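Handout for the seminar on molecular recognition.
Each group receives one record of this type.
Step one: identify the two inputs.
Step two: read the structure output and locate the region that could contact manganese (II) ion.
Step three: write two sentences on what you found, then compare them with the reference statements printed after the record.
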Amino acid sequence: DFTQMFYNQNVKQFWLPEEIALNGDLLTWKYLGKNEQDTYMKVLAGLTLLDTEQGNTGMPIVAEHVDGHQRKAVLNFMAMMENAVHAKSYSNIFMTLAPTETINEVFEWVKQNKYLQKKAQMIVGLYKAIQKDDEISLFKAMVASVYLESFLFYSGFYYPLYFYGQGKLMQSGEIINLILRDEAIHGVYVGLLAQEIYNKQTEEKKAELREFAIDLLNQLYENELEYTEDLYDQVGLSHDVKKFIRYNANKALMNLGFDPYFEEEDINPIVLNGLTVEPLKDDDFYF
Amino acid sequence: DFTQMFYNQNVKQFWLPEEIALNGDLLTWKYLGKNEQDTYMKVLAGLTLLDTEQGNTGMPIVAEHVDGHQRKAVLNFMAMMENAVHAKSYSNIFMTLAPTETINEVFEWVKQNKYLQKKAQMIVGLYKAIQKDDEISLFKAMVASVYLESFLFYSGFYYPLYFYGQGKLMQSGEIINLILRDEAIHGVYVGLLAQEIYNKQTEEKKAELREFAIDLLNQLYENELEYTEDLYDQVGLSHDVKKFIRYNANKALMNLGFDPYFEEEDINPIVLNGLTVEPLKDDDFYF
Amino acid sequence: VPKWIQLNNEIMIQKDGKFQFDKDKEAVHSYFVDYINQNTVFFHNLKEKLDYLVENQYYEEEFLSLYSFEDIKEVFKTAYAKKFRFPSFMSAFKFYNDYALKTNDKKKILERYEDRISIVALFFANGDTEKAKEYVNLMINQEYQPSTPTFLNAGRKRRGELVSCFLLEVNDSLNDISRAIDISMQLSKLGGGVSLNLSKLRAKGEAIKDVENATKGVVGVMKLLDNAFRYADQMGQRQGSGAAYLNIFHRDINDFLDTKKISADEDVRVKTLSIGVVIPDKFVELAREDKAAYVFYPHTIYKEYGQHMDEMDMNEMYDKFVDNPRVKKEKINPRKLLEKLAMLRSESGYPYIMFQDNVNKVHANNHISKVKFSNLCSEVLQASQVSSYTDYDEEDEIGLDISCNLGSLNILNVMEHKSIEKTVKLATDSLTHVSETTDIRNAPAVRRANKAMKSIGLGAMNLHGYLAQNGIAYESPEARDFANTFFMMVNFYSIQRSAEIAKEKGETFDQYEGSTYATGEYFDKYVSTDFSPKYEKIANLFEGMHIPTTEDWKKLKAFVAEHGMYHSYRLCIAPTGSISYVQSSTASVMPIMERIEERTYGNSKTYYPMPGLASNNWFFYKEAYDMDMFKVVDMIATIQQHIDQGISFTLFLKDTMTTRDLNRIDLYAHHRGIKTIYYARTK
Amino acid sequence: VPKWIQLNNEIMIQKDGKFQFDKDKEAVHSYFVDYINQNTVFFHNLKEKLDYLVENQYYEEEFLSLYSFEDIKEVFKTAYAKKFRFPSFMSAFKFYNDYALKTNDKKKILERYEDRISIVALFFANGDTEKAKEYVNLMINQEYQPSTPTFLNAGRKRRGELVSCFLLEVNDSLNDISRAIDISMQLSKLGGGVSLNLSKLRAKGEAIKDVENATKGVVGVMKLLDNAFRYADQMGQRQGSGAAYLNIFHRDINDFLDTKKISADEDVRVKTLSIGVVIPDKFVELAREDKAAYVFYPHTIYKEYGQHMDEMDMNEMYDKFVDNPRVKKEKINPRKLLEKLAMLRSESGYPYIMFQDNVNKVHANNHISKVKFSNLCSEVLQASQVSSYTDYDEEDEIGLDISCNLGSLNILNVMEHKSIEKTVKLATDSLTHVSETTDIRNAPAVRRANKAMKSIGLGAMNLHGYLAQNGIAYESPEARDFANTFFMMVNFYSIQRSAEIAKEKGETFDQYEGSTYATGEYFDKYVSTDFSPKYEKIANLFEGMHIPTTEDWKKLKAFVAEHGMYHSYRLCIAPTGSISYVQSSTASVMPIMERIEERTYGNSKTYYPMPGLASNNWFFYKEAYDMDMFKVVDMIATIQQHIDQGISFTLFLKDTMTTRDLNRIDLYAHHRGIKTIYYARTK
Amino acid sequence: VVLADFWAPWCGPCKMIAPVLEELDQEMGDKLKIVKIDVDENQETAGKYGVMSIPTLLVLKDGEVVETSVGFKPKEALQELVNKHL
Ligand SMILES: [Mg+2]
Ligand SMILES: [Mg+2]
Ligand SMILES: [Mn+2]
Ligand SMILES: [Mn+2]
Ligand SMILES: [Mn+2]
Ligand SMILES: [Mn+2]
């Protein structure tokens, strides 16, 4: 009921890194404090590392196990965007803002970081556990994918959106907004594929899959809180970032056809600013 | 030395069939004989099948086994083109020119056609035989992919080109030329990757790989002859198409770094004609 | 999860294969004990409560001043003498969430049900203690339910108006269009729904003072009104709901209908404007005979004849328009237009189908004006005159714009008390008081028509609930017999009370002498046909009640001729979808949509079983979607013959039925005398 | 392609390295001979033409009845005695496509240039034959150009209004907002652009009758105004254009700017509503010191102080608002808001920037009111009083709303004829006649202010054309010296004519005694500083014309003190757009955007070199984008000091110049005394 | 032993069960009585047996309800349901 519509929306959102000139960001970058520059670098590396997993494994593995030519085509298109567009875009932002040696060090740090690794490996673990012709294992991986696309990225997206909403780092913020817009539709689409599997299950199996999804969400959420404090306490933003994580967790659940887990909260306004005909045959006029 | 330039070429060649309006072919299509329309539908259906498998299976599987994020990005992009752009374009052509029943019948015809099933069996079999960290199985699949890109498509491409060259079906022909332009660069790129693996081997191993490549080519060739006769005898063109596929077989071999295998012949000249946000500072408020 | 919601959640937890309907009483008891009593601020005496509410701008001091404090105290005591207990959790939840007065921080409950009822009764009586106690007994017995604006805002200071709906006639000028936008925003600020007649607006591509093909048609006015209602949306408490009505012979009818298409672009699509289509009998005749029809340009007709297109009789003037070379028109297919209407109702529920000739054939005030359009709920069918708003510093020719004061009878409670006469008369008095105390300074035509017409709306509800709780199937002929008898008695007593009010006040509604009430044409079918029940089972329901006979109707006709009628319009059946929960009644005379409604308020689902739903009457509460729509049309036409205004008739359709089935239901409704069709709900 | 269009395309065909500028005259000759002379209706005599035009409702009869036919014939002979010839094909094309009167089927042409000019002159003179001949000489010499509404509609029955602008004050009420919508539509149907001051409207989240967070802000009012202007699209021939102005200290200023963002959703975005931002000096001071600023909720200030936010001097009351706990506000960053303004102007050219203190520092009528907002062209700066439009059948408090009585002096033709005094006085008389004959009944405040203030707008055009054709660079100090002298002369003679009209009629404008003209404060810089040219080359341009001296200004000040001043406002420099082609002039006092304009008409590509362009003055006609914007600001500020109203100052920006450069230009304009900034045109 | 079918004319699943009951009567009609009751015309019986939904099949033995089946059932499932009580 939905693949051709998503095909259309995906291909009409096509874009390339070269379209946004990045050099003018140096005019606001130079005015940020060390903690702001440090947080931005770390967040950016976090997003880059997670998105690479999605391009190399997440999207291609789902495309491999999903049946249907049209679904495979949409999934291929999404994998292409991860590897050919998003990955180049993140690299471009980095090369503009930091010298080569600084980029290498930030990636070394974020690669060793406990909270980034915990979530990256949890997601990758579920992708590696998919078994041929087993729709339960596929569903679990789709849940992981939706959580990455619609939830885990957002502790990171917060900061570029925060600057973007203030008039700072506008070129890279525009790029991030385009990336985020792609991840949103990726999350919705994979969510619909997961609901299709979920709806084929018994009531007991459904309850079991719901418990899986909520348990996974809880593990990721508790690690996100730690990840958030680790990055954002030094710039005083953690309270507001936490509200943004919960709001996006609720969107991820709704993508999977589940009820929201967290109470509704308002979001930081700066980040918000960043964001059957049958013809009448006669004899029907007579009764 | 080459991936970056292929990356740039592939992304700059990006297109969608919807860019080309097809209603202009309606009259030249109406005017073709029943035999001509039948061959044309079947030819494009055979192409659709090849692109379906190249997009679903061939390109993604090669992407999985080839090392390097940039090489993977090129291969992922090529995969997307196969199933999200090329395979779909044929349906755009079908939906314009043919009634639903004729479309349904031709897709049923691909399923039961023995030559089309044989060529798919052979090519996809080699893709699915790739073993992780086994460069020889990968080479064999890359040879199969080059043969699909640079040889097997051409029994199909002949007919749209033959019409384009006579000023007939020129909108459909424009789509086909764009597809052909893509496959030419896809065949070169995969050919270069295959040569990388071949060049790592002993002379004895190389001799075996040439045997594999030539045996496979001959087996595919003999099947393609029967396919060509089956499609083109009713339009009187089988001998001409055979010359064309031999011409392109030589190009496939060359893409693999091998000498031409068939003698040169005169191709129908008709077919040849068918080819910033800078912030304010304290000193801007005083003049 | 709250305890009351969890107990209410136990309804669908079936034990022994049966629903736990007894858990709803437990749910309401838990709701009260754990939330309502705890969150209700209590005063040492009623004097302290009234003083606190008057001083804190909660109550008007004017309406409480006509009673001595002992009178108000005794009114409250006789309100609590009933010891009213809500029968379902949803009733109490809806009341204390939508109507009960709360503090400025919306944290504590200031009004009980018996306090809201007492305040509304004191407002209605206007200085009469005995009448106030009569109103208290009427409402605490839940025999009569004042409309949501009246029940919610009677006696309150932070109030809008007590009128639930307004109908505006838009004339064909920029001054009139701008004033219509102004009045729509003013009345939406007051909280009432606004319906506008766009049939007088000239078509798209018409001439503006020798400048030809300059008009944007009625669709530009729809965009203006849509943005006006979005702007004046009661600050977000409830989105501003407006209605636009267009005659089916207007040229812009296709553009008018295309506003509700999903494929329509945002430059032509309206979102807060409900659309209604007025279908004269001529359109049905043309569609039946398959002749090609013509929609006309209203300004050409105005120039040729001097009267607006909707002001003339379509059945008589259609051939003259078609044969007139000076009347511009475009050819349409009436059957294709009917199919477009059916598909639009299937896909969106719009437009509101109004059969103009079905309204005007039994309309008592055709001398004042024909009924050219309905309200936002397609049940207020009253005569209206367009207002010619002139330039600034130029006196405007103020016409009549319909203001409808609504009130609902609970058929179950009215019949169980054997009090049709007293309930109808007290409700008529209360609606008369609401009409009198209502003034609207920013709508001259609404105010003028409220003062002159004195039209009220006395609806009814819990028809299906009463029938199912009495073992009567809504589609059965016994149900139609009961509806015939009950609504004949309701009409009899409403007319009697209107005549008594006209006698007591010595005044009738303006232009009463030209109405069928004065000439006696209204009572012809009542002095000729006896409407007593034909089934002994139905006749046993009216035991202990005097059913008006033919002689009684003759006496009432003579009484009306001698003394007149105070109200131009008295009966109109509104959907009453919100107050139905509080009264534990089914919405309107419509059949129930669901036996157990599933509602989500927050993060918890709250099931509402139908009033009186149980195991013995499970199949009598047949869902409206499973029912034959022809039988529902028969029921509504049986009711409609005793209602001078319209009935909010909602069509409940299944997904299996096509657009031809919808057209068949529409044409059967037109043939059976149905005046208006509200919605096409698909399951 | 047509012969004239083909000849016009030979302008860009370069022979011997030079443009074929002489081909343009051949283009005019071909155009006339092959199209105009063939498709102009010719009558046996002027009597037959006049009878045909009045009888067929092309002309009004009242203005022609003031003259005998001999007088009209003499006036037309005077127009044709000049034997005016269009020097460029684009001039004739513009006139005979836009302003020439055509038959009702548009197949033929009824008016020549000498006919439209004669009719406009006969309208202006009002029964005076000598005055009509003087106006004919003034317009056929192309010294003075009446505005597009006045030139188009003078003496024609099928017309709109001769008024170009309408500046409406919108009070903080639903009745006032509804009246604003009504008046906006009633003035858009007249043709003139409408600008509205929305700073009095309370912000989003304000209270409506003591219920909090109820308002949706000024953005909803902008939605209503945008759809009102879309509805009043003047047939669609010229889309309904409207402006909205908001003080930068208004709380909704961020949402006010957010509607012009391309990324803005359709639920907030407005399309036909231009936006302007009024920036007091206080905001610039706050941005300069990089201290946190506050945007205030207007209704809290109105409740606390009894006065609107924009009626109080923010430079004095900003601290009082900030330290007032009963005044609601939120902290903002003034430099971030300035950067947002700069990027919004880079992306879309909006908003118009109005420096309120720059306007009010030299505003003569501050006693009547301070200038709170500008017009759609961001060049009218007049005192306005809000109108309190009350509920129906209640008397409304009518204020003052501004209107454009516009006319432009052709600086080239004015100074070639050495008739600055005569041209300025005749233009002032014509604008006075236009203001007097304007009677708008549906806009009460507009009519009252037109009767009371009697304000007119006398602009100038062809400044860059005159400078380049006289070998003066636009950025050169000699150009600024010439502009100083010329506009001081224009101001002197406009004040002199206003005082003469006040003496001859015995009346001044309303509340003249409080103006700086009566107190003599206006003439301080004129009696203290000599504005004679400081350059010998510039002084030779004024040879043969008496340049007013300090003593002459003292005599004028005494004359004004004794006799008064008839016009509250006299001078305002409009953009002078499509009518600049007809006069063969550069648009306004702005520098030329391109040396040769590339215009598309149908299937043809038409080229319009700026008047007088040739090889010798090719580099004097420097493109506006190539100019230094600081020197253009200097030029305008030199002109601005002699213009009592504002100047439509368009910023011409290169693609490489960032938002910091735009902000530097804006702050230099504010520092140099620029009153308004119209557009940010990026190349 | 009686198989009582609670049905309605508008119920799609009730139209599907009608031919299944006719085949069941041909095979088992010597040991099984099949009774149909229209719930649109006979609300009191449908209320007495607490019928919720249609088709509802009650197996009665000597006037007592011994088994209840809701929704559509194929012939073999109805035979198994009845054969338990023969
Ligand atoms: Mg009119
Ligand atoms: Mg007010
Ligand atoms: Mn990505
Ligand atoms: Mn993604
Ligand atoms: Mn391909
Ligand atoms: Mn390929």
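Reference statements: The radius of gyration of chain A is 21 Å. Chains A and E do not touch (no CB pair under 8 Å).
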